[PDB]
Design an enzyme around this catalytic site. Structure first.
Site, short mmCIF file in Angstrom:
data_model
loop_
_atom_site.label_atom_id
_atom_site.label_comp_id
_atom_site.label_asym_id
_atom_site.label_seq_id
_atom_site.Cartn_x
_atom_site.Cartn_y
_atom_site.Cartn_z
N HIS A 269 52.04 45.78 32.97
CA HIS A 269 50.86 46.32 32.26
C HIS A 269 49.87 46.85 33.31
CE1 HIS A 269 49.65 42.29 33.22
NE2 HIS A 269 48.43 42.81 33.37
N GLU B 152 41.59 45.58 39.68
CA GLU B 152 41.22 44.19 39.72
C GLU B 152 41.04 43.75 41.19
OE1 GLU B 152 43.76 42.09 36.83
OE2 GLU B 152 41.95 42.26 35.57
N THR C 137 45.12 36.94 35.82
CA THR C 137 43.80 37.55 35.76
C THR C 137 43.18 37.65 34.36
OG1 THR C 137 44.53 39.84 35.69
CG2 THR C 137 44.24 38.91 37.92
N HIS D 139 50.46 45.86 37.23
CA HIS D 139 51.00 44.55 37.52
C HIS D 139 52.42 44.42 36.94
CE1 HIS D 139 46.71 42.78 37.72
NE2 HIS D 139 47.03 43.45 38.86
N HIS E 90 45.51 47.72 34.17
CA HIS E 90 44.08 47.55 34.03
C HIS E 90 43.45 48.87 34.48
CE1 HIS E 90 44.52 43.19 33.47
NE2 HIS E 90 45.55 43.36 34.30
N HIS F 63 44.06 43.86 24.49
CA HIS F 63 43.46 43.68 25.81
C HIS F 63 43.99 44.73 26.79
CE1 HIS F 63 43.30 39.47 24.06
NE2 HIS F 63 42.04 39.77 24.32
ZN LIG Z 1 47.29 42.14 34.84
#
Ligand SMILES: [Zn+2]
EC number: 4.2.1.1
Length: 257
Positions: free
Chosen positions: A91, A103, A195, A116, A93, A61
């Site tokens: 991590h 996000e 999230t 994050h 996104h 992911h």
């Molecule tokens: Zn995250």
């Protein structure tokens, strides 16, 4: 089952995770003109001098950089927080193009990526207990824009070739997360959620106003990662972001005027 495609993406999550439609979901759009300066906020304290990173993992992911959280070595305190929160992992996104990937959004603007830094409240003893509590996590969110290179990110991009596919991990010691922070600690804060599934409503969000800059070459290396496992048809790991969710009965507070 869950992922970011047409048949398993954010619009499908609620069938296995009904809290996806809950009262304090993340991310959200930050309307800067509606956010309230709060004089009650105390200064934010990021203490990362003794951080101990362990390794990096492609989980299908995103990729996670994991830390030793068995003592108070890297903690977040102050701001809106009561108590001490330990760093467990970070991590990112990111998007397929430089105009999407974050996000959270700021007056509907999407950044190229979002970092994050995930911390858990030491009064709950371990991370799995903390995610069952309304004040169990504090996540420090940092926007990325494409411009100049970030020297402190280069060590991360250097190791991605070794974790291309789902389930691959590698040793990742002696990485200093201080090198991922902007100059200013000015922030927005609100109560929300994880999230990704299980989408638990356990997070105090702290979103920095100042983005960090990374270069095009750094972000292109993120987009070479794969969602699939080794030996499977290639599906590039891009657009692993959840869109903004309804703010409902929440107020976003600002630490600055
Ligand atoms: Zn995250």
């Amino acid at each position: 089952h869950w992922g970011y495609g047409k048949h398993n993406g954010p619009e499908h999550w609620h069938k296995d995770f009904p809290i996806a439609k809950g009262e304090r979901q993340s991310p959200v759009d930050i309307d800067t003109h509606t956010a309230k300066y709060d004089p009650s906020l105390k200064p934010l304290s990021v203490s990362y001098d003794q951080a101990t990173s362990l390794r990096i993992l492609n989980n299908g992911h995103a990729f996670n950089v994991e830390f030793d959280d068995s003592q108070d070595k890297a903690v977040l305190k102050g701001g809106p927080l009561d108590g001490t929160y330990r760093l467990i992992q970070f991590h990112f996104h990111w998007g397929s193009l430089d105009g999407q990937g974050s996000e959270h959004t700021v007056d509907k603007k999407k950044y190229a990526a979002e970092l994050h830094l995930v911390h858990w409240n030491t009064k709950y003893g371990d991370f799995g207990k903390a995610v069952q509590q309304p004040d169990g996590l504090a996540v420090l969110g940092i926007f990325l824009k494409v411009g100049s290179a970030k020297p402190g990110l280069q060590k991360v991009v250097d190791v991605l070739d070794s974790i291309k596919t789902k389930g691959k991990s590698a040793d990742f010691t002696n990485f200093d997360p201080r090198g991922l922070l902007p100059e200013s600690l000015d922030y927005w804060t609100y109560p929300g959620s994880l999230t990704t599934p299980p989408l638990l409503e356990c997070v105090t969000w702290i979103v920095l106003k100042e983005p960090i800059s990374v270069s095009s070459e750094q972000v292109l290396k993120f987009r070479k990662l794969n969602f699939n496992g080794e030996g499977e048809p290639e599906e590039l790991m891009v657009d692993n972001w959840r869109p903004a969710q309804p703010l409902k009965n929440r107020q976003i507070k600002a630490s600055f005027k």
